Amino acid sequence: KKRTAKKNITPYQRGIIRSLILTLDCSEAMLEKDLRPNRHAMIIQYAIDFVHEFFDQNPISQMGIIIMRNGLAQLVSQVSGNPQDHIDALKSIRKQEPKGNPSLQNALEMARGLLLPVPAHCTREVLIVFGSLSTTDPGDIHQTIDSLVSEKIRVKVLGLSAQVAICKELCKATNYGDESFYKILLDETHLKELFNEAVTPLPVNKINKGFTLVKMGFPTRIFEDTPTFCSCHSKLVYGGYFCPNCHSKVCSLPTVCPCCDLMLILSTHLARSYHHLMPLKTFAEVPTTEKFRSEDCFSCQSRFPILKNHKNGKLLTSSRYRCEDCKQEFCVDCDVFIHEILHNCPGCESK
Template identity: 60%
Template sequence: MQWLDLWTLLPVDRLLRDTTPLQRGIIRHLILVLDLSSAMAEKDLRPTRYLLTLRYAQEFVLEFFEQNPISQLGVLGMRDGLAVRISDMSGNPTEHILAIQALRAKDPKGLPSLQNTLEMARGALFHTPTHGTREVLIIFGALLSSDPGDIHQTITTLVTDKIRVSVIGLAAQVAICNDLCTRTNDGDDTAYGVASTNNIFANCS
């Protein structure tokens, strides 16, 4: 099963499949966020959530640029309660793939912070042209977020800045993820999906 089977849960993929040729000329600006917290060390996905995510994230980057050749992508991580910049926003898939590959040498640790990472993503997207999309796609393996302030205020700012957030959970549903996706996608709660180890990754091991 391909990594993009995961994304069919979300509007991120439907945007690619359902738009007209004219609309496909739109420039997308996407921040891919990877959970690098200790929750990713779990082995319910083989060999671990962490290593499987890194593997398929690389495939996603290639697929993204094949379908969106003039678009921009950046990669962030969540570790030890901090946001980590993995690769800057650019249209060079090789740069992103090498940066993701380098993460294999590090172990997942600590807690994730959705708020800190969303604020960093917002900063990266702030100066992108308004005629393109502003998107954040989060792979979230934890069941909680260690945030320094009011994440609901951060979500309100994302809505104001027209930044759409989608989340793929690797564990159970988390209320704040549902709220984040629903509010930033005009009330559409389908931007949040939880991957089932029984189907989404059934053929990945």
């Protein structure tokens, strides 16, 4: 009795840069009573969580937020790389209440307009949190979908408790045909993990596309305190960074230089990327009676191994889920922790 992914078969490519434009759904449907406060409040709360998470794991991307009220798509946060703006925008929205019908077509068109400036190496995306069971379009939709797939704009949507044919067509269409991206939910926890899996970059099997070197430079922190002075918000700020080339102060960020317009990063962002590129082989669960290995943990020192012949208890299993390449044991907690938070396998590091 195990619930594990068999194997990862695109551990070669992902979209590391991103520009994901999450589009919420604020329309009369979202006011029904299936999720604890409503659909809407729970949705926005989880949206905040996802914003934090996504801007953590992909700390070099941008993001924009879009609502769908009264059949209109009203941008509530410009495509920007500072999580706090989007966070505040969502805060503001959550106190406002939905109305009108969701105009999927308008939101789609607004996005396609929005992502034009994003350069070729950056990758586009949208994430429709579609909640209702209808749309209300002021135009042909398949027209838009065709324009989309022409502009190389992958789309993933998370329907609420139903399946809508057009959305299924939409996901199947933009994502190079390979349909896996219209996942819809059946529980709140399912919803949390839905957003979580939306956080990561997105491979399926990438067509051979243009791969391009991108100019960027790293800043150096500043020293003085009273000389507070800023060139990205025109304030007094007690000390920040210096563009190596533009050579002007910039308040703390991985932002783009507001003088000479080149990307700024430290490295730790690149480190996050590295973590996403080449993950580990999924740790194997050791055979119950065939292990005969050390009775402890390895990374930690846990005493949860077996019980040695106990009718049904020992017949159950032997908590020895052990990674492959280092071939050392690890208790369940250690394996969960390694594969979730820190991806340097303890033993596999040491040799």
